[PDB]
Ligand binder design. Sequence first.
Ligand SMILES: Cc1cccc(Cl)c1NC(=O)c1cnc(Nc2cccc(C(=O)N[C@@H]3CCNC[C@H]3F)c2)s1
Length: 284
Amino acid sequence: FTTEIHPSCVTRQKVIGAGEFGEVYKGMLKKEVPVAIKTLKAGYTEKQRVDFLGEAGIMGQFSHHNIIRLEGVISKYKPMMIITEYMENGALDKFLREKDGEFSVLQLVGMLRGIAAGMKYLANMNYVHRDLAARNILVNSNLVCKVSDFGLSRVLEDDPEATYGKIPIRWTAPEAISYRKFTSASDVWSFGIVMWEVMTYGERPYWELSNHEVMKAINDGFRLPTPMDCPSAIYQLMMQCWQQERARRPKFADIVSILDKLIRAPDSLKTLADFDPRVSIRLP
Ligand SMILES: Cc1cccc(Cl)c1NC(=O)c1cnc(Nc2cccc(C(=O)N[C@@H]3CCNC[C@H]3F)c2)s1
């Protein structure tokens, strides 16, 4: 099933994420290998237990470089724990915002290829993520990006960015907002937003537009503008992720292939899409 770990092998050291029902810790697994540790405090309900251990069950079924690896679970003792590999650099959105401009275009594009490879794996495994966003991508000390945040109802319920179904509007495909059609193709729309987040170093999609204004703009055909210093091929790809008609979007296999080709002929990334400025500075 999954690996049951004895509590004596686990040492919690730092809180890296807290919540009402539990906390996420950085720790060590047997003071030897660093791990992340997610707990479930006493008094949890049946639904909370199913959702909590269900996340571990889903992760245990995956084995991919760009998907968070499960080390094991503590279920025989309390509190219960999910133990995974430790991603040293945290969530991608916060990571990019705190390292603004510090990476090359080729590095940024390689992050996107890793994310896409993880999503292609998930889609082929018949797993729809529903909440793909930079905040749900984790980064390690090799700059590898791994898709995180698995489960069923639990995913959108626990994301504060998801607003009342209960979804994160700015990242969500129109068919999923409109009539709750979540598929790998709505994940592709979300991946286009993640592309835009990466190339902007964590800019907030649609900026200060309200949720209703975002839905209104999308339905009227508006799309996010080109990031600064963005390869033309990258902007073209994210625009095709945002096709209103779900059947016109690339599959993840197409995305990975295109990103592979660009990275392997890296001069192709030097052709930038035009950036339309929001300030005019004219000097005599
Ligand atoms: C444990 C677990 C259970 C179930 C699902 C999952 Cl995906 C997990 N694993 C995790 O939640 C995590 C795995 N790795 C994580 N790494 C992480 C997350 C958030 C912040 C940090 C972290 O150390 N962030 C910064 C990095 C730079 N400044 C110092 C640190 F605070 C690391 S969280």
